[PDB]
Amino acid sequence: SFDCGKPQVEPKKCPGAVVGGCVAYPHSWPWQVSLRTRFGMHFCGGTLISPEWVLTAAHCLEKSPRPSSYKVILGAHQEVNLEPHVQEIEVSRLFLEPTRKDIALLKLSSPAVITDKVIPACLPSPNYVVADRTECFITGWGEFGAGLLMEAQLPVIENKVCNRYEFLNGRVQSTELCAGHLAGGTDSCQGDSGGPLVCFEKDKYILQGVTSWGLGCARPNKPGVYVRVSRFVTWIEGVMRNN
């Protein structure tokens, strides 16, 4: 329950060839956040990147500018009947990324207790470019909702290829990345808007992508598009240290 990116429960690691993905082993994605309204309704995902900081998608915040309207559920596995020791914390502040405005930082009113069920994802070094065909996972509750936390393994597709004429045709910005399959492939729509796309780097998981509604999920004849986290690291750190 220490270093970022190292679950204390080892991930199942759903093979890429499973349709619909797999149910995660409980607490194997300890940074996984469930975003809810004050009335406790799950509508988005997010990633714990510090005891006091959650990274999510700006689109998740469209229905309200008031930081008190949002609750962050950490340590969860079930979507509805929440586990006994799940941490439920009010957001004190919102910081919308200013250039692209696709992601946001939520500051938690009280810090999260770091345990072996609740651990931060590691951030990539600035401007890092995840290589073509790197295997990553997306996790979340697919929000019928999944009910239990799901995972799916998706390969990254370099922007140059993903932007080809016959595929996404120039619409993927350098501040985004693609993952999934170009043609064929299973529908991998297991994440929540705002949820994580992490990739294992020899001994820990690094958050490389943030899923977005208005972008997409990995579909059979179209990959998913994720905000490229490495391009917002210095900003993220700046917000954290100065706030």
Domain coordinates of the chain in residue numbers? 18-29+121-230, 30-120+231-242
CA distances from 105 to 42, 174, 180 (A): 18, 21, 26
How far, rounded to the nearest angstrom, does the alpha carbon of residue 119 sit from its chain's CA centroid? 14
d(CA 159, CA 140): 24
Q: Which residues are catalytic?
A: 59, 102, 193
Of 154, 180, 137, 178, the closest CA to residue 32 belongs to 137
Which secondary-structure segment (H or E) carries 240?
helix 233-241
Strands (E), the chain: 22-23, 32-37, 42-50, 53-57, 70-74, 87-96, 103-108, 135-140, 150-157, 176-179, 196-200, 205-211, 224-228
Interior CA angle at 209 toward 208 and 210, to 5°?
145
d(CA 93, CA 108): 7
d(CA 76, CA 158): 32
Beta bridge partners of 140: 150
Are residues 92 and 67 in contact, defined by beta-carbon separation less than 8 angstroms? yes
- Hey, what CATH topology would domain 30-120+231-242 get? Thrombin, subunit H (2.40.10)
How far, rounded to the nearest angstrom, does the alpha carbon of residue 229 sit from its chain's CA centroid? 10
Are residues 84 and 75 in contact, defined by beta-carbon separation less than 8 angstroms? no
Task: Tell me the resolution in Å.
Answer: 2.3
- Hey, what CATH topology would domain 18-29+121-230 get? Thrombin, subunit H (2.40.10)
Q: Is 114 exposed, middle or buried (0-12, 13-18, 19+ CB in 10 A)?
A: middle
Method: X-ray
